[PDB]
Amino acid sequence: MIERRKIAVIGSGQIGGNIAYIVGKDNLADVVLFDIAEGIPQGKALDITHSMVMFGSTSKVIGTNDYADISGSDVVIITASIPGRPKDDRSELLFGNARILDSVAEGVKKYCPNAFVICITNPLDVMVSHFQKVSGLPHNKVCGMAGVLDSSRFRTFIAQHFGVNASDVSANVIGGHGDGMVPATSSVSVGGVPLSSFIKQGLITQEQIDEIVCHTRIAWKEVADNLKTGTAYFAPAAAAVKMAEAYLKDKKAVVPCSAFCSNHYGVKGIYMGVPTIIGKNGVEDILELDLTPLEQKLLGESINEVNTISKVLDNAP
Amino acid sequence: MIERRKIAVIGSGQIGGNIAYIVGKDNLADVVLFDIAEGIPQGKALDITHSMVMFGSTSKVIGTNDYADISGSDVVIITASIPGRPKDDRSELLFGNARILDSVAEGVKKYCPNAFVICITNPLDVMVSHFQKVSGLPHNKVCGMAGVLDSSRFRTFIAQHFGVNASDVSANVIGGHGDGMVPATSSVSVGGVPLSSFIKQGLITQEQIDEIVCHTRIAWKEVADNLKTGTAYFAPAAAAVKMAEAYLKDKKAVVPCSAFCSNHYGVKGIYMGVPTIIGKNGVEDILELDLTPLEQKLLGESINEVNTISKVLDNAP
Amino acid sequence: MIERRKIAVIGSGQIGGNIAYIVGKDNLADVVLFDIAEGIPQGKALDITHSMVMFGSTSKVIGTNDYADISGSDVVIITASIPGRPKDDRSELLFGNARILDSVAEGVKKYCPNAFVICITNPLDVMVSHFQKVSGLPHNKVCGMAGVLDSSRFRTFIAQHFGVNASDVSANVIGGHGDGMVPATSSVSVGGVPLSSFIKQGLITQEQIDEIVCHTRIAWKEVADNLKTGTAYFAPAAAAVKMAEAYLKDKKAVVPCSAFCSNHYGVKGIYMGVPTIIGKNGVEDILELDLTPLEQKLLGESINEVNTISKVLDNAP
Amino acid sequence: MIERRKIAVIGSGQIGGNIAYIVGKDNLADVVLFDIAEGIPQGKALDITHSMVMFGSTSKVIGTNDYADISGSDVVIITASIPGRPKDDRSELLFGNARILDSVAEGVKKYCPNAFVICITNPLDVMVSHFQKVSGLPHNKVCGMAGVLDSSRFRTFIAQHFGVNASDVSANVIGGHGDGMVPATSSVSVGGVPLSSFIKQGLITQEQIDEIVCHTRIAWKEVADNLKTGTAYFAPAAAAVKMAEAYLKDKKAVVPCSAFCSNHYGVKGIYMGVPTIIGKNGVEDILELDLTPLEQKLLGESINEVNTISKVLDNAP
Ligand SMILES: CC(=O)c1ccc[n+]([C@@H]2O[C@H](COP(=O)([O-])OP(=O)(O)OC[C@H]3O[C@@H](n4cnc5c(N)ncnc54)[C@H](O)[C@@H]3O)[C@@H](O)[C@H]2O)c1
Ligand SMILES: CC(=O)c1ccc[n+]([C@@H]2O[C@H](COP(=O)([O-])OP(=O)(O)OC[C@H]3O[C@@H](n4cnc5c(N)ncnc54)[C@H](O)[C@@H]3O)[C@@H](O)[C@H]2O)c1
Ligand SMILES: CC(=O)c1ccc[n+]([C@@H]2O[C@H](COP(=O)([O-])OP(=O)(O)OC[C@H]3O[C@@H](n4cnc5c(N)ncnc54)[C@H](O)[C@@H]3O)[C@@H](O)[C@H]2O)c1
Ligand SMILES: CC(=O)c1ccc[n+]([C@@H]2O[C@H](COP(=O)([O-])OP(=O)(O)OC[C@H]3O[C@@H](n4cnc5c(N)ncnc54)[C@H](O)[C@@H]3O)[C@@H](O)[C@H]2O)c1
């Protein structure tokens, strides 16, 4: 007896609504939009439902305030957050969002403990770790969306320099989703050609590469300062869907995401951005990039950044 | 020498952003997001740009406040509007949006007069008529999105009663996009079966049909009352994209939309909801539904409402 | 634990290979190409496998001669047939293909008795009935591909007359997949407009409608006589995939197909072409079209045709 | 005034039919299937036409034997060939196909000289060179499909070893489409990780890499030996469509193909497999891979094989 695939979206704000829209459009799964705010998920679900016939999709999209309705969810995507964008740092949301995730963890533990959980709520890496701890779900079934967004920005900026299809740029961002994130320039390639070759050919300079690295790191503020009323939500939504696809279709896709890293990158059990393989069993493996000594040091500094914010949370009021 | 297809989105609010998102996802065309509001179109364009690699699309999406950037646009979709939802009737936005569309009309007339123009700005039918007059574009190259949304809702509600795929329901809403809209029950079919047969078979009652017709007419309020911030925007965006697809791909698709009807439905030159054929020459034809006497009367009342609101706009200092 | 969807294609000839190609392209499921001929399914599977990366699909496609490899198949599509096209009638393959289906039934019964079975092997309606009888699978889990092909041809020919998108033509063919098939002109509509209206408007004649009906009935020979080496295989393959999609995605799609009809169309338990609803439980309902007295008589003659060939099979040597 | 995109397929055999099928399914363009064989292109075009409504596509697909019907074609894909698979080497088809391409060249030169031409006919690299000379079309508007197929096989085999999505493997095959083809192991990456790292990590041996390289070179025989009727045709068709997409959508995609290389890889005007950038102006650029001394030597041997076979064609009565 085949059953419809089911994705629960916890938090039906800017990102949550976009996820439902795209999931429905692709007919990837049925969607349950959950929110504590009255009307919001219901209104978005009805609106998106009307669009399904236009897209030729038979996906069902419903809005709810009841955790019983996320029962049997294959994937749970957590977007729930306290209101207002971060001013200077994503960690400003730490204390409030940790408390939200405590409640979300109780819902998931009760109604869909076998779900693959994708966290989006900031500060991403610490929130993922917090959710895994309080929910008690297996490490391989809990991860955070970040690397796909960061790497997509990184790839896009490289692609825009060379004037080529971004899909043909290979580029990874690793470490914590913050100022310390590490766009690994050493393993960048465009159609198989490394950046070192493009430098020799005079088609890109190291300063231009440095600018692209900086642009990747500050990209969230560039979008946020232009939108004014909030942070990015079109690309983060799409990134989460790509991760959900990898799980639901058992793709064995290489997905940069915040995952529990135990025998790689010199760490012994920490949630941080790494290249994973995602399939039907969740996070099934982690790949080891060839990092330069400089990149290894920058990754070390990112790890310190993650541990620092994590310790602040451990000593929360 | 083939050129990239180009869609201009005038107004980068709730609907405009979704249009850019979906157009980019489908790689239907490049997108220019235009708005007078500072930052907004630029922020959304950058955000959506980051998602393009995630979707495997090479569409370019840019934000601007300069009408020179919509030059060479194949399609122009107008969402520009004064802020705030209508309380009781869509015609509350009449005067403000009429003035807005004057500026849009001069922009299109100057920089892309050969564009196919799809209006979304409310009050839809009168705004479409208004834009055509001030812009001077051919009647067949200017239309309004409404019928696709209304008909999609109608199809969805019928489908939900019978428990079937809405794509296999054929159903049209005609007349003005307002309370007087006419969900034509006489031409409803589900996989070839008409409603009259379903009544005889005992699978639906006339009362249930009446409820579906009413639901269709008031559907906009059901969404808006729940969103508690504005009107529907996921489905309206998708509908506009389907209309743009019909044009850009020369589909000869049957598209219910607000079009200039001059020799059908007992009218002699009025913009109202009718079943059109859309291809590379814009609105290429209008189909004549086999309406009952009751439906002809209801359509007459719709035409009166359109004329009434249109005359109020014509009579101003 | 989510598992990959799995389709078994029994017979890896012209149709079988196309099914695997399209299923793989859409990433609808993994495919097992089964055939008794050495090398054929293996070669096609390897070739199609190479294309998967080009389509961005992670579907696995393998070739085999072992029924153990169809274990756990969600859908089984039967294309197996004795060599050579029919000269004048599809029933020429009756005796040989009945024997093939005996063997296929033993494989399915042993390794995937819960599979949804879609028969393509001709003569279609009698082969479907034969397979259900010998396999012992539930009536609702065994059906034949025919109506989607016949109706698609019917819709296409109508669409080509009016110069419109065929997707906007509603048209059904019912009865046995043979000379007696009944293209139901009475329930044809183009964007909601019935043929009777187009006749009054002077846009189509009854003779032109009769030609389209005739063309639909003889379409198989038109393709076959041009191909020379066999019968149609691109459209029949696509039709089967649409049916597989409806089941796997639980679409509740209206699908004309050869199904067990017990309380509709004046029959009390016969496999013939009817409009069905297909979902996760297979054939879940049958819709009753509004047939004219003439159409009811033609359907009666089709039923006689089906019973005649069925009785020939019952008295096979 | 936008026009429908148009692809001409010259030769409606195994590959040509699949190209038409997929192009139509994707609604990438209208298709003209050309062949000298009576009935074949007409039969396939009619068959594929019936499937268009099933796929929700409005692409027109027609069959012909008249070069006047390829007038205004944006892309021309040449599959025309003498019958029968090669026994040991692709160059066995040299003289017969050279004469065939003479007639195709005069057709294209007369009716669509501004078309982007993608050759598939073997022996690929020499046939591409031959067509360019006799047709007189710009070097950048004529290329051959090979690299996409060879690289796709290479990527697939690498992906199968590591158990990952082949889409996340970056890998190039360069040089002539023959035994001398060079799967460039030095620029292989899996999610950013190079093969040298995988060796150090103990996840692959040099012997396994050598096997993959060999498998890639002989892959055509593995398929052909199993098909027992001709050569591969599902993947070659898909590859040609991906190249047509890059052109028609102006993707600026990195496409390994047989292109006119005049200032890269130590050659001064030869058609061979190289990583190109394809957009609306055809072959717009060629990327320079960072090849090892061994790979440079292997590429030199490939260039010799191409020159050898090319000289045999030049020397004829
Ligand atoms: C990691 C990354 O790249 C990235 C990118 C963009 C946004 N984000 C984060 O994603 C989160 C959501 O962003 P957004 O969608 O724009 O925010 P927003 O539009 O404010 O939506 C948040 C939603 O959460 C709802 N909510 C609040 N409390 C609860 C609760 N206890 N249970 C369920 N729902 C609740 C709330 O009603 C609102 O609809 C924020 O924390 C962002 O910082 C992360
Ligand atoms: C016909 C139909 O079915 C339907 C459905 C939903 C919404 N609508 C209408 O569509 C319109 C837009 O809806 P929305 O996107 O939710 O509204 P909203 O999110 O407010 O977006 C409107 C945008 O227009 C911009 N704008 C204002 N003045 C100008 C100007 N002179 N030039 C260019 N841009 C300007 C403004 O900055 C804002 O970003 C409204 O009038 C709605 O009533 C129609
Ligand atoms: C209903 C409808 O619309 C329609 C349309 C087109 C074709 N068909 C029928 O579909 C069938 C297949 O057509 P095709 O693919 O062109 O035919 P073809 O290309 O000959 O393929 C038939 C395949 O079946 C294989 N086969 C033979 N015996 C067995 C067996 N015992 N077990 C497993 N495999 C076996 C055989 O090796 C061959 O590869 C024929 O019976 C056609 O008449 C039906
Ligand atoms: C480069 C590469 O990777 C690759 C892969 C697979 C096949 N191929 C080649 O592609 C070619 C076609 O393969 P196929 O489709 O399997 O072969 P096949 O199925 O025989 O089709 C060839 C078609 O060309 C037609 N034809 C013959 N002469 C002419 C002419 N003068 N004008 C127009 N059409 C003509 C002929 O009627 C036939 O339908 C062969 O040469 C293969 O070797 C190349």
PDB file of C-alpha atoms in Angstrom, chain A residues 1-5 26-28 56 58 60 74 114 247-252 279-281, chain C residues 1-5 26-28 56 58 60 74 114 247-252 279-281:
ATOM      1  CA  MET A   1       0.000   0.000   0.000  1.00  0.00           C
ATOM      2  CA  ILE A   2       1.769   3.117  -1.292  1.00  0.00           C
ATOM      3  CA  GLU A   3       0.994   6.277   0.692  1.00  0.00           C
ATOM      4  CA  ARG A   4       1.416   9.895  -0.371  1.00  0.00           C
ATOM      5  CA  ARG A   5       4.683  11.502   0.703  1.00  0.00           C
ATOM      6  CA  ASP A  26       6.690  19.982  -8.075  1.00  0.00           C
ATOM      7  CA  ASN A  27       4.151  17.476  -6.681  1.00  0.00           C
ATOM      8  CA  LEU A  28       6.962  16.265  -4.391  1.00  0.00           C
ATOM      9  CA  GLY A  56      -1.061  20.348 -12.852  1.00  0.00           C
ATOM     10  CA  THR A  58      -2.476  16.906  -7.125  1.00  0.00           C
ATOM     11  CA  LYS A  60      -2.728  18.552  -0.946  1.00  0.00           C
ATOM     12  CA  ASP A  74       8.255  11.883   6.179  1.00  0.00           C
ATOM     13  CA  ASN A 114      10.808   8.793  12.401  1.00  0.00           C
ATOM     14  CA  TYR A 247      15.732  12.282   1.160  1.00  0.00           C
ATOM     15  CA  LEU A 248      12.364  11.457  -0.436  1.00  0.00           C
ATOM     16  CA  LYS A 249      13.875  10.250  -3.731  1.00  0.00           C
ATOM     17  CA  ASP A 250      16.908   8.567  -2.094  1.00  0.00           C
ATOM     18  CA  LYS A 251      19.219  10.494  -4.429  1.00  0.00           C
ATOM     19  CA  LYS A 252      22.544   9.934  -2.647  1.00  0.00           C
ATOM     20  CA  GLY A 279      19.373   9.485   0.884  1.00  0.00           C
ATOM     21  CA  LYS A 280      16.443   7.515   2.323  1.00  0.00           C
ATOM     22  CA  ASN A 281      18.358   6.968   5.612  1.00  0.00           C
TER      23      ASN A 281
ATOM     24  CA  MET C   1      11.511   3.802   6.060  1.00  0.00           C
ATOM     25  CA  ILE C   2      10.733   5.237   2.618  1.00  0.00           C
ATOM     26  CA  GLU C   3      11.696   2.948  -0.272  1.00  0.00           C
ATOM     27  CA  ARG C   4      12.259   3.852  -3.914  1.00  0.00           C
ATOM     28  CA  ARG C   5       9.237   3.373  -6.161  1.00  0.00           C
ATOM     29  CA  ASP C  26      10.917  11.845 -15.015  1.00  0.00           C
ATOM     30  CA  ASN C  27      12.535  10.116 -12.005  1.00  0.00           C
ATOM     31  CA  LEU C  28       9.115   8.527 -11.382  1.00  0.00           C
ATOM     32  CA  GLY C  56      19.414  14.905 -13.803  1.00  0.00           C
ATOM     33  CA  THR C  58      18.846   9.230 -10.046  1.00  0.00           C
ATOM     34  CA  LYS C  60      18.109   3.042 -11.500  1.00  0.00           C
ATOM     35  CA  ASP C  74       4.737  -1.270  -7.203  1.00  0.00           C
ATOM     36  CA  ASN C 114       0.345  -6.640  -4.625  1.00  0.00           C
ATOM     37  CA  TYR C 247      -1.259   5.137  -9.264  1.00  0.00           C
ATOM     38  CA  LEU C 248       2.130   6.058  -7.767  1.00  0.00           C
ATOM     39  CA  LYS C 249       1.140   9.659  -6.963  1.00  0.00           C
ATOM     40  CA  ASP C 250      -2.450   8.782  -5.937  1.00  0.00           C
ATOM     41  CA  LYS C 251      -3.768  11.419  -8.349  1.00  0.00           C
ATOM     42  CA  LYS C 252      -7.438  10.391  -8.480  1.00  0.00           C
ATOM     43  CA  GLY C 279      -5.250   6.320  -7.309  1.00  0.00           C
ATOM     44  CA  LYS C 280      -3.159   4.435  -4.738  1.00  0.00           C
ATOM     45  CA  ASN C 281      -5.800   1.647  -4.557  1.00  0.00           C
TER      46      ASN C 281
END
